[PDB]
C-alpha cells in the first residue's frame, strides 16, 4: 500500500 503501517481503524 501507500501507507502500509497505518492501523486499520485510522483513515477513511
Amino acid at each position: 500500500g501507500p501507507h502500509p503501517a497505518a492501523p486499520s481503524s485510522w483513515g477513511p
Epitope: 501507500p2 501507507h3 502500509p4 503501517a5 497505518a6 492501523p7 486499520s8 481503524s9 485510522w10 483513515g11
Partner: antibody
C-alpha cells in the same frame, strides 16, 4: 480494560543478548511495538509485530533484532544481539489496538531499564 | 525514513495561555500522525491519533489538526497537568519514527 506487564534481565555486559518479554491481559487488531529511550534523550522506535503478522525493525539496529509473538500466551518479546553501551536505555512495550467501535488505544508498559556496561 | 521535525524545542507558558506545537513530516503521511505526552519518570501517554482524534478521556482542550506534512497540536487553555514533553509519531510506513520532542515548561 487492558493491562501490560513486561519483564527481562536488565543488567548486561557488552556483546551479550538482551531479551525482554511483554504480556497483555484483559481486541482483534493490535500493534505490538518496542520503543527505547536512553536517559535524558528522546524516543527511538525498535520494532513492531502487528495482528496481520507484519514484522519490521528499526534499520539502525542493523539486523541485530529478533521480534517474536507467542499468540497462545499473548507474549510479545524482543531480542537484541551484541549489545554495547549505546543500547543502555529504558525499553518500553506498547500495545496499540482498537476496540469493538473503532476507538484507538496505545497503552505503554512501565519500561525495563537495561544497562549495558563492563 | 520519514523524518519528523517538531518545533519549538521548548515552549515557556503559564496556565491559561494557549499552546501551539508543530510537527512537520519529511514526506506526506496523510493523517497518520499521533501525539504523546510524557512526564518525568513515566511512560508516554497517547493524546491524539490519526492527526485529529482524542484518545478516550483526553480533555477537549487538546486539539490536533493537519494532513499531509504539517501538523499542529493546540492546547487552548493550559492546566498545571499539561506541562510535560510532547512527541509526535508517524505510522504511515516503517520504520515508525518520532519527532525529537517539544518541552512545554511553566513560564515564571
Amino acid at each position: 480494560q487492558v493491562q501490560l506487564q513486561q519483564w527481562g534481565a536488565g543488567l548486561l555486559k557488552p556483546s551479550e543478548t538482551l531479551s525482554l518479554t511483554c504480556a497483555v491481559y484483559g481486541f482483534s487488531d493490535y500493534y505490538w511495538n518496542w520503543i527505547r529511550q536512553p536517559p535524558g534523550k528522546g524516543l527511538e522506535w525498535i520494532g513492531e509485530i502487528n495482528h496481520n503478522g507484519n514484522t519490521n525493525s528499526n534499520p539502525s539496529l542493523k539486523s541485530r533484532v529478533t521480534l517474536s509473538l507467542d499468540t497462545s500466551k499473548n507474549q510479545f518479546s524482543l531480542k537484541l544481539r551484541s549489545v554495547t553501551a549505546a543500547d543502555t536505555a529504558v525499553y518500553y512495550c506498547a500495545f496499540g489496538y482498537s476496540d469493538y467501535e473503532y476507538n484507538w488505544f496505545d497503552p505503554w508498559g512501565q519500561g525495563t531499564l537495561v544497562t549495558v556496561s563492563s | 525514513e520519514i523524518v519528523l521535525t517538531q518545533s519549538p524545542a521548548t515552549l515557556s507558558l503559564s496556565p491559561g495561555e494557549r499552546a501551539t506545537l508543530s510537527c512537520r513530516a519529511s514526506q506526506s503521511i496523510s493523517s497518520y500522525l499521533a501525539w504523546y505526552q510524557q512526564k518525568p519518570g513515566q511512560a508516554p501517554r497517547l493524546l491524539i491519533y490519526d492527526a485529529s482524534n482524542r484518545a478516550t478521556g483526553i480533555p477537549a482542550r487538546f486539539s490536533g489538526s493537519g494532513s499531509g506534512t504539517d501538523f499542529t497540536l493546540t492546547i487552548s487553555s493550559l492546566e498545571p497537568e499539561d506541562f510535560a514533553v510532547y512527541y509526535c509519531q508517524q505510522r504511515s510506513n516503517w520504520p515508525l519514527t518520532f519527532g525529537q520532542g517539544t518541552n512545554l515548561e511553566i513560564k515564571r
